[PDB]
Scaffold this active site. Structure first.
Site, PDB file in Angstrom:
ATOM      1  CG  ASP A 114      -1.799   1.177   1.351  1.00  0.00           C
ATOM      2  OD1 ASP A 114      -1.934   1.908   0.355  1.00  0.00           O
ATOM      3  OD2 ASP A 114      -2.380   1.371   2.448  1.00  0.00           O
TER       4      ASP A 114
ATOM      5  CB  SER B  95      -1.970  14.197 -13.646  1.00  0.00           C
ATOM      6  OG  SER B  95      -2.366  13.938 -14.980  1.00  0.00           O
TER       7      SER B  95
END
Ligand SMILES: Cc1c(C=O)c(-c2nnc3c4c(C[n+]5cc6c(C)n(C)c(C)c6c(Cl)n5)n(C)c(C)c4cnn23)c(C)n1C
EC number: 3.4.23.22
Length: 330
Positions: free
Chosen positions: A35, A199
Site C-alpha cells: 500500500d 498530472s
C-alpha cells in the site's frame, strides 16, 4: 541488494493485490496488501481477537526465534474506506522477494474492523508511503522500504500491476524489459506523507487532451481512480445511460456498454487506461448495472491514482534524497 516478488489479484475484479512476505524465523509467509498510501506493516496474528479472524493466515511471534516485543509500542490506523485496525508491535526479520530487513517493525493486530475480517485473502498490509505517516506510538517506526533503502542497489521500488493478471513489485532496480518506450519522471511532494504528484491533464476516449494540473497520490492500496468531479463527469458523459447513484455510492453504467479509454498526463507523456480497466462489474450479483472504475474525489479531499490508473503503467517510486515518480507505458 534487490528483491522481486509477484503480486496477484485477490479476485476477478482486481479489487486488491496480495504479495507473499516472509516474517520471522523460521519464515511465516503471509499475503500482504502492498500500500503506497500508508506506512504501517501490520498483520493478522495470534493476538487478533478470535471472533475477528475468518480464514486469514496469522503471524505467531512466539514461534519466531527472531521476534522481539517492542515494549510499550502501540499502533492504530484508519483508512480512506473507513476500515481500521490496531494493536502492539514486534520487531522481526521480514523478507520480500529475496530482500531481507532485520529489525523491521511488525505491527500485530489485536483488533481489526469488519471489512478486514470478511476478506479472507488479505493477511495484513505493507505500507510503502513515507515513514512520517507511520502510526506507532510513542516511537514512530520506519517502513520496509525505508529500512531497506541504504542496502538497495538503487533507492527505488517499482509497481507493475496486472489487469486481471499477476504483476510484480521490485526493490532496488528498474527492470528495463518490463515497459515500452521511456520512463517519464515527475516531481513529488512529501508534505502530506504520500507519493503526491501533479498530472498534466486528461483525455476521454479519442477526444482532445485537456491540459490541466491535477494533484493526486499514487496509491497502490486504492482500487479505483478518484478524480475531480468535473473530470469524472466528462468521462461518464461519454457512456450512454451512465449516472451517479447516491444509493450505490458512485457512477454506475449499463453492463451492455463499451467503455472509452481514459488518458492521463505525466509531463508531456501520456498513460492510456483501456476502457475495460474501468469496468468493476455488476453492482450486485445478476444486476445489469455495473460499477465504474473512475469516481469523484469530491469529499475525499485528495485525488487518488489508484490501481485502475497504476495498472496501466510501469511505475517507479524513486526514494532518492529528493523523491520522484516515474511512469512508463507497457
Ligand atoms: C478514499 C478512499 C479509499 C482510499 O484508498 C478507498 C479504498 N479503495 N480501496 C481500498 C482498500 C483496500 C483494497 N480493497 C478494495 C476492495 C473492494 C473495492 N472490494 C469489493 C473488496 C472485496 C476489496 C478489498 Cl478486500 N480490498 N484495502 C485492503 C483497504 C484496507 C482499503 C482502504 N481504502 N480503499 C475508498 C473506497 N475511498 C473512499
Amino acid at each position: 541488494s534487490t528483491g522481486s516478488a509477484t503480486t496477484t489479484p485477490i479476485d476477478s475484479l482486481d479489487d486488491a493485490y496480495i504479495t507473499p512476505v516472509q516474517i520471522g524465523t523460521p519464515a511465516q509467509t503471509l499475503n500482504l496488501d502492498f500500500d503506497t498510501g500508508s506506512s504501517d506493516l501490520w498483520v493478522f496474528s495470534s493476538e487478533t481477537t478470535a471472533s475477528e479472524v475468518d480464514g486469514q493466515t496469522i503471524y505467531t511471534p512466539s514461534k519466531s526465534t527472531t521476534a522481539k516485543l517492542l515494549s510499550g509500542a502501540t499502533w492504530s490506523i484508519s483508512y480512506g474506506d473507513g476500515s481500521s485496525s490496531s494493536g502492539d508491535v514486534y520487531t522481526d526479520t521480514v523478507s520480500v522477494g529475496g530482500l531481507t530487513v532485520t529489525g523491521q517493525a511488525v505491527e500485530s493486530a489485536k483488533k481489526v474492523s469488519s471489512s478486514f475480517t470478511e476478506d479472507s485473502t488479505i493477511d495484513g498490509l505493507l505500507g510503502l508511503a513515507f515513514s512520517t505517516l507511520n502510526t506507532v506510538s510513542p516511537t514512530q517506526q520506519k517502513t520496509f522500504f525505508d529500512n531497506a533503502k541504504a542496502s538497495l542497489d538503487s533507492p527505488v521500488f517499482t509497481a507493475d500491476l496486472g489487469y486481471h493478471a499477476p504483476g510484480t513489485y521490485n526493490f532496488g532496480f528498474i527492470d528495463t524489459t518490463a515497459y515500452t518506450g521511456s520512463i517519464t519522471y515527475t516531481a513529488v511532494s512529501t508534505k502530506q506523507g504520500f507519493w503526491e504528484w501533479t498530472s498534466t491533464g486528461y483525455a476521454v476516449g479519442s477526444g482532445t487532451f485537456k491540459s490541466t494540473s491535477i494533484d493526486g497520490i499514487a496509491d497502490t492500496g486504492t482500487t479505483l481512480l478518484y478524480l475531480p468531479a468535473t473530470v469524472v463527469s466528462a468521462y461518464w458523459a461519454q457512456v450512454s445511460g451512465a449516472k451517479s447513484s447516491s444509493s450505490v455510492g458512485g457512477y454506475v453504467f449499463p453492463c451492455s456498454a463499451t467503455l472509452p479509454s481514459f488518458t492521463f498526463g505525466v509531463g508531456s507523456a501520456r498513460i492510456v487506461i483501456p476502457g475495460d480497466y474501468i469496468d468493476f462489474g455488476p453492482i450486485s450479483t445478476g444486476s445489469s448495472s455495473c460499477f465504474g472504475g473512475i469516481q469523484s474525489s469530491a469529499g475525499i479531499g485528495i485525488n487518488i491514482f489508484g490501481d485502475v490508473a497504476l495498472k496501466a503503467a510501469f511505475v517507479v517510486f524513486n526514494g532518492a534524497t529528493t523523491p520522484t515518480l516515474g511512469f512508463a507505458s507497457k
